[PDB]
Amino acid sequence: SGVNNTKKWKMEFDTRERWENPLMGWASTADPLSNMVLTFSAKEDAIAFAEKNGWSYDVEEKKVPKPKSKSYGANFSWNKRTRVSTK
Amino acid sequence: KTSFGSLKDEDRIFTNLYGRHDWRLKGALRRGDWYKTKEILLKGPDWILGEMKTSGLRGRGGAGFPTGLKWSFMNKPSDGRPKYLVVNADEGEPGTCKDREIMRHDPHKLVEGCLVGGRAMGARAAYIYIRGEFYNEASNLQVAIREAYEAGLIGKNACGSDYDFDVFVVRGAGAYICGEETALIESIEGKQGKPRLKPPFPADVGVFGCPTTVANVETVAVSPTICRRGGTWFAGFGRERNSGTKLFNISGHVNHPCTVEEEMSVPLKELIEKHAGGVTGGWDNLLAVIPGGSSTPLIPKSVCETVLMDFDALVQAQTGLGTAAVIVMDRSTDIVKAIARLIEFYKHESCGQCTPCREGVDWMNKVMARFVKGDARPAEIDSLWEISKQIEGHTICALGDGAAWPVQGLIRHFRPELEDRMQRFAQQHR
Amino acid sequence: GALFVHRDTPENNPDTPFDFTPENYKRIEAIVKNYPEGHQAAAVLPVLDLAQRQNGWLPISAMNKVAEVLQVPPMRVYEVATFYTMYNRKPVGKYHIQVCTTTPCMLRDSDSILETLQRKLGIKVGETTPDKLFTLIEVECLGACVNAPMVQINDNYYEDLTPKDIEEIIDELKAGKVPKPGPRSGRFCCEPAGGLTSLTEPPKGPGFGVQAGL
Numbered sequence: 001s002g003v004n005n006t007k008k009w010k011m012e013f014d015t016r017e018r019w020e021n022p023l024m025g026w027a028s029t030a031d032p033l034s035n036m037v038l039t040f041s042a043k044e045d046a047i048a049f050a051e052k053n054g055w056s057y058d059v060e061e062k063k064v065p066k067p068k069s070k071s072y073g074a075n076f077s078w079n080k081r082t083r084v085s086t087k
Numbered sequence: 088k089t090s091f092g093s094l095k096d097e098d099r100i101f102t103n104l105y106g107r108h109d110w111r112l113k114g115a116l117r118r119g120d121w122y123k124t125k126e127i128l129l130k131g132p133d134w135i136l137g138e139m140k141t142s143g144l145r146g147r148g149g150a151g152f153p154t155g156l157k158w159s160f161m162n163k164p165s166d167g168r169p170k171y172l173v174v175n176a177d178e179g180e181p182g183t184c185k186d187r188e189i190m191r192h193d194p195h196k197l198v199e200g201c202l203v204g205g206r207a208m209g210a211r212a213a214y215i216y217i218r219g220e221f222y223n224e225a226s227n228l229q230v231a232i233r234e235a236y237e238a239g240l241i242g243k244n245a246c247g248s249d250y251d252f253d254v255f256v257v258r259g260a261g262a263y264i265c266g267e268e269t270a271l272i273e274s275i276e277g278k279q280g281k282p283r284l285k286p287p288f289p290a291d292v293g294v295f296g297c298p299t300t301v302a303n304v305e306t307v308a309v310s311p312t313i314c315r316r317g318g319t320w321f322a323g324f325g326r327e328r329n330s331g332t333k334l335f336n337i338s339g340h341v342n343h344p345c346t347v348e349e350e351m352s353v354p355l356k357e358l359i360e361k362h363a364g365g366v367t368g369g370w371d372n373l374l375a376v377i378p379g380g381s382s383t384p385l386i387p388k389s390v391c392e393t394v395l396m397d398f399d400a401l402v403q404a405q406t407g408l409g410t411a412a413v414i415v416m417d418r419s420t421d422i423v424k425a426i427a428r429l430i431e432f433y434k435h436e437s438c439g440q441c442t443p444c445r446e447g448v449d450w451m452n453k454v455m456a457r458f459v460k461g462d463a464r465p466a467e468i469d470s471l472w473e474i475s476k477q478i479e480g481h482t483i484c485a486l487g488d489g490a491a492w493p494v495q496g497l498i499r500h501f502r503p504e505l506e507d508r509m510q511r512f513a514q515q516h517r
Numbered sequence: 518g519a520l521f522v523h524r525d526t527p528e529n530n531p532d533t534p535f536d537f538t539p540e541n542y543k544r545i546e547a548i549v550k551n552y553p554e555g556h557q558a559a560a561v562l563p564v565l566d567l568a569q570r571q572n573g574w575l576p577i578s579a580m581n582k583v584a585e586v587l588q589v590p591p592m593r594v595y596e597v598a599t600f601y602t603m604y605n606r607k608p609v610g611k612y613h614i615q616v617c618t619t620t621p622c623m624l625r626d627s628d629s630i631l632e633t634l635q636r637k638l639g640i641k642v643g644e645t646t647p648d649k650l651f652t653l654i655e656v657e658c659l660g661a662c663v664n665a666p667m668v669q670i671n672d673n674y675y676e677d678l679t680p681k682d683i684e685e686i687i688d689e690l691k692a693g694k695v696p697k698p699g700p701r702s703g704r705f706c707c708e709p710a711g712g713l714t715s716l717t718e719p720p721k722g723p724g725f726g727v728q729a730g731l
């Protein structure tokens with residue numbers, strides 16, 4: 001339920017091929033940018049950083065949970081379906 | 088006046104306390120019940136609530152809230168929902184048996200009290216929730232209710248007052264927590280007796296989600312007499328803000344354990360000696376008293392000498408009036424084992440809903456069991472004190488608080504007795 | 518000891534026969550009508566209690582029948598049957614002896630009553646006699662502490678007991694007689710022994726002390 005990891009903008013690269021190492025079975029790669037993650041304070045900072053480095057980018061809008069109406073008293077309604085059968 | 092006690096039989100309300108007169112309607116009428124009820128009803132809600140406010144009556148279920156203020160939360164225009172009065176007859180606090188006598192010997196006082204109180208709140212019916220173990224009392228109460236229906240005193244056109252009122256009896260199935268006012272409402276609604284959080288308050292959202300007042304049997308039963316004889320008469324007993332008469336249960340180590348009606352603010356010493364026949368073996372044999380039932384902390388013999396039995400006086404003694412159930416322990420008693428068995432009760436009675444009481448009370452119970460043997464070290468006494476303070480004030484309902492206070496009463500007044508057992512246990516093994 | 522999970526057995530399973538007798542069905546619809554329309558889950562505690570008064574105890578089939586009769590989910594009936602301690606989810610004896618051992622009773626020697634019952638019946642608390650006529654358990658306060666020590670046997674209270682008194686009550690039940698509820702000490706209910714200290718005067722009659730203008 002913690003939300004502390006949904007507060008900063010992140011830049012990550014497109015995932016590339018990983019393959020099995022014949023000796024040990026380890027996951028091998030040829031992608032030098034496979035672990036690169038950059039943190040940004042604003043969407044506009046991240047866009048600016050990608051553009052000067054010549055990287056094509058896709059930007060997705062931040063999703064905030066919608067405000068909700070919580071009423072503990074609704075659990076005991078006279079005539080509504082919100083009445084809970086158990087506690 | 089500054090001296091209280093020596094109540095006269097003319098001023099007693101529960102005149103058939105001991106079941107020596109007929110408990111049916113014929114006897115109840117002779118004793119003055121159901122007299123001028125139609126007159127009281129037609130004087131209206133505001134007048135009735137005025138009498139209860141003037142009398143200074145306070146809750147008899149344990150918490151002692153001013154009754155007239157509480158009952159006035161229902162004095163509001165309806166919103167299309169029915170209005171209800173619940174009468175708490177669960178009576179499950181160890182040491183308390185006062186409500187049991189009202190229902191079996193003065194059932195028509197309670198039924199009339201339901202109507203007068205139900206009218207003042209504007210309620211359509213009364214649900215009396217009685218503990219399941221009180222089967223014979225529940226059947227006495229239904230016989231009285233049937234008699235009142237046949238005589239026109241309740242039901243359609245109650246007492247000829249053009250006001251409709253029903254009185255249903257619902258029985259519990261064995262749970263002390265169902266005496267908590269919102270756990271009782273849930274149990275009526277067919278659920279586990281788990282208390283609700285507040286808000287909402289029952290006067291807003293109660294049983295079936297409707298405006299409700301939960302009132303104690305003793306609170307409800309004395310209301311018709313307060314209206315007939317007036318709030319000034321009732322306010323003439325006990326200290327200010329602690330007025331009226333009260334039913335006391337004296338049990339434990341007394342010569343004559345009994346139930347008796349006495350004026351409020353009566354000295355605790357006078358109550359035990361006059362009515363209960365004194366402490367088993369003399370006043371000097373007294374060790375400690377639990378003055379309000381299990382939930383109230385014990386006090387030692389030194390405090391008991393001068394303490395008055397009313398709400399404010401026992402608050403200054405670091406305990407409380409509670410249900411006015413006096414439990415007496417003489418010096419032959421194992422004080423630690425006595426309080427440990429009370430923690431064992433609360434552990435068996437926790438509804439389990441909320442973390443501090445579900446886990447904490449069970450934790451306190453285990454530590455107390457080790458304190459009885461002395462299988463602990465004195466550093467744990469302060470640990471148990473802190474654990475009880477973590478439960479208190481942090482739970483949904485007052486059961487958690489009522490479990491913490493007995494521990495604190497023991498630690499406050501009998502720390503040397505605990506540390507002495509730990510010393511004996513350590514040397515008995517080392 | 519007393520578990521809160523059901524596991525099927527031949528004697529207790531969903532096919533164990535249970536039904537309400539026709540007389541008890543008339544009693545159910547009186548119970549249900551005590552509540553607002555559309556709030557008939559309120560009838561679970563009485564109806565579930567009625568199934569046990571007919572049957573003595575509650576197999577899973579009896580709980581399932583209550584849920585169907587009231588059209589509540591069975592889990593909501595199971596929750597109730599496992600919460601309230603008066604429902605017997607295992608069979609009990611003909612006489613269910615319940616001895617209070619809370620502190621007000623313990624101070625007046627409820628331990629002696631429990632010891633006498635164990636040795637007399639030859640069982641321990643929580644067990645049933647081999648002939649299945651008594652079950653013995655300890656209970657919390659029954660609201661009769663001034664009349665301690667006391668026991669409940671089915672719907673009746675037997676109070677102000679001594680080891681000799683409890684033996685008599687056990688003999689009467691083995692014989693087939695009903696002992697009689699109440700104190701076994703000489704007093705009638707909750708009065709102080711040795712004479713009333715209050716309410717010795719006649720009641721004052723109708724209209725006494727009424728305020729003027731009422």
Ligand SMILES: Cc1cc2nc3c(=O)[nH]c(=O)nc-3n(C[C@H](O)[C@H](O)[C@H](O)COP(=O)(O)O)c2cc1C
Nearest residue numbers: 146147148175177178179266267268302303485486
């Ligand atoms: C665990 C617990 C048990 C209670 N048991 C009872 C009871 O058996 N009878 C009662 O009148 N109040 C009992 N109360 C107090 C009620 O919650 C409530 O305050 C009271 O019944 C109604 O208010 P009144 O006394 O002013 O009339 C209990 C409270 C708690 C926390």
Ligand code: SF4
Nearest residue numbers: 438440441444484487
């Ligand atoms: S304090 Fe105890 S009895 Fe009260 S709601 Fe919490 S767990 Fe239940």
Ligand code: FES
Nearest residue numbers: 617622658659661
């Ligand atoms: S302590 Fe036994 S009946 Fe109350």
